[PDB]
Amino acid sequence: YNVFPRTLKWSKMNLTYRIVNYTPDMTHSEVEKAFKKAFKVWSDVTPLNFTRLHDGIADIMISFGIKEHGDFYPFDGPSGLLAHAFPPGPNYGGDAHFDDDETWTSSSKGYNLFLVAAHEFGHSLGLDHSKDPGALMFPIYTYTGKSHFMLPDDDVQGIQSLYGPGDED
Amino acid sequence: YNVFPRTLKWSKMNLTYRIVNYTPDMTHSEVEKAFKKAFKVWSDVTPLNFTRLHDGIADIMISFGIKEHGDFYPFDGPSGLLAHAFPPGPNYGGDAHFDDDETWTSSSKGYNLFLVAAHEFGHSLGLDHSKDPGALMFPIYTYTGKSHFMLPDDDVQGIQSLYGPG
Numbered sequence A: 001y002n003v004f005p006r007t008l009k010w011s012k013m014n015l016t017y018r019i020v021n022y023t024p025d026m027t028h029s030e031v032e033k034a035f036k037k038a039f040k041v042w043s044d045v046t047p048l049n050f051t052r053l054h055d056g057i058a059d060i061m062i063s064f065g066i067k068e069h070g071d072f073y074p075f076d077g078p079s080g081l082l083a084h085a086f087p088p089g090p091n092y093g094g095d096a097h098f099d100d101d102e103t104w105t106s107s108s109k110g111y112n113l114f115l116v117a118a119h120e121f122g123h124s125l126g127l128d129h130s131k132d133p134g135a136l137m138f139p140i141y142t143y144t145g146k147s148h149f150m151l152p153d154d155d156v157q158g159i160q161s162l163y164g165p166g167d168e169d
Numbered sequence B: 001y002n003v004f005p006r007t008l009k010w011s012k013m014n015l016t017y018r019i020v021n022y023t024p025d026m027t028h029s030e031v032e033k034a035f036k037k038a039f040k041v042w043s044d045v046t047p048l049n050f051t052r053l054h055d056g057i058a059d060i061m062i063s064f065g066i067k068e069h070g071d072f073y074p075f076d077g078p079s080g081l082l083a084h085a086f087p088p089g090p091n092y093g094g095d096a097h098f099d100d101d102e103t104w105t106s107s108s109k110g111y112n113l114f115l116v117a118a119h120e121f122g123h124s125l126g127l128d129h130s131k132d133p134g135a136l137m138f139p140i141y142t143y144t145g146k147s148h149f150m151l152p153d154d155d156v157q158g159i160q161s162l163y164g165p166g
């Protein structure tokens, strides 16, 4: 027999993702680069592996949409809500949605896609919000301006409490 | 940091359920008896008690629906998905939905409602699928044709590991 796990998390280390569509704001290459880097933020500190699928059903379906887009969390036009992701689970579990009424960038203008994505994927993996103002999972977008990204310890401890550290070096 | 909390089991031994609507394939009486029998499967081997409510919100809301029915976990027409239930918790947690594009029965043709319900209620209580081919919680529907239902030991051990014996 089997009882449901104690925490909401993926029961497999090999996960797949699919970029269903693209925002008008960035080139396909820019968007792909941003998401790949965001997944690496988490794979670098756990035993998780992320493989991209170009079609079909992936564990983490990524898409850009506006207003009502297929769930109980419609977006609200420019400003306000910017994106959200569902926690680990069947069907839409793990999926990540980005509000395409926002401005997405690979720089410091508007919302940095990589940064927001890293945050959303945290939710896709089982992390909720943190009270640490400097955490990636803090609820409010707080771009620091630094050039090098380094996952805050609060986030490291959180994700490892779910999946372990993987190779520590 | 924070993770998403998982209610491993109901924090109370007395649970409520409500049959919201009925399938066209069986009489109201047959449906009611099938669900009552399904709950008895689990209460017979644990301290759990189930009481039926005829209105309002119950811990376990039971309903029949087709395709997209309100939770974005759409059914797929005849065959395939038969039903699904949410693990313990508030709101949808514990609720059980049955695909009404399937043919349900108790003593005629179709999938045995009691059997599927017993399986789904197992999920409502905190049980995942079992690897034992003959267990109630095995993922594949396998009707044996016997007139008497006996909960397999695997399921007994599983549910009791959460709630203990009756």
Ligand SMILES: O=C(NCc1cccnc1)c1cc(C(=O)NCc2cccnc2)ncn1
Pocket (backbone or CB within 6 Å): A112, A114, A115, A116, A117, A119, A120, A134, A135, A136, A137, A138, A139, A140, A141, A142, A143, A144, A145, A146, A147, A148, A149, A150, A152
């Ligand atoms: O703001 C943050 N977290 C909260 C949040 C994040 C997303 C969506 N909602 C709420 C946040 C920002 C940064 C940061 O600026 N790092 C420098 C950086 C950024 C991009 C590329 N290279 C270096 N670090 C850690 N947490």
Ligand SMILES: O=C(NCc1cccnc1)c1cc(C(=O)NCc2cccnc2)ncn1
Pocket (backbone or CB within 6 Å): B112, B114, B115, B116, B117, B119, B120, B134, B135, B136, B137, B138, B139, B140, B141, B142, B143, B144, B145, B146, B147, B148, B149, B150, B152
């Ligand atoms: O098939 C089974 N389990 C897997 C399953 C069950 C539901 C949904 N998905 C997967 C299963 C079937 C039976 C059985 O036939 N017992 C006789 C019986 C049936 C009805 C009324 N009285 C006596 N026993 C134990 N496990």
Ligand SMILES: [Ca+2]
Pocket (backbone or CB within 6 Å): A075, A076, A077, A078, A079, A080, A081, A082, A099, A101, A102
């Ligand atoms: Ca918005």
Ligand SMILES: [Ca+2]
Pocket (backbone or CB within 6 Å): A058, A059, A060, A061, A090, A091, A092, A093, A094, A095
């Ligand atoms: Ca998914």
Ligand SMILES: [Ca+2]
Pocket (backbone or CB within 6 Å): B058, B059, B060, B061, B089, B090, B091, B092, B093, B094, B095
């Ligand atoms: Ca409920």
Ligand SMILES: [Ca+2]
Pocket (backbone or CB within 6 Å): B075, B076, B077, B078, B079, B080, B081, B082, B099, B101, B102
């Ligand atoms: Ca079906």
Ligand SMILES: [Zn+2]
Pocket (backbone or CB within 6 Å): A069, A070, A071, A073, A074, A084, A097
């Ligand atoms: Zn959405």
Ligand SMILES: [Zn+2]
Pocket (backbone or CB within 6 Å): A119, A120, A123, A129, A138, A139
């Ligand atoms: Zn968030």
Ligand SMILES: [Zn+2]
Pocket (backbone or CB within 6 Å): B069, B071, B073, B084, B097
């Ligand atoms: Zn449903």
Ligand SMILES: [Zn+2]
Pocket (backbone or CB within 6 Å): B119, B120, B123, B129, B137, B138, B139
């Ligand atoms: Zn099942």
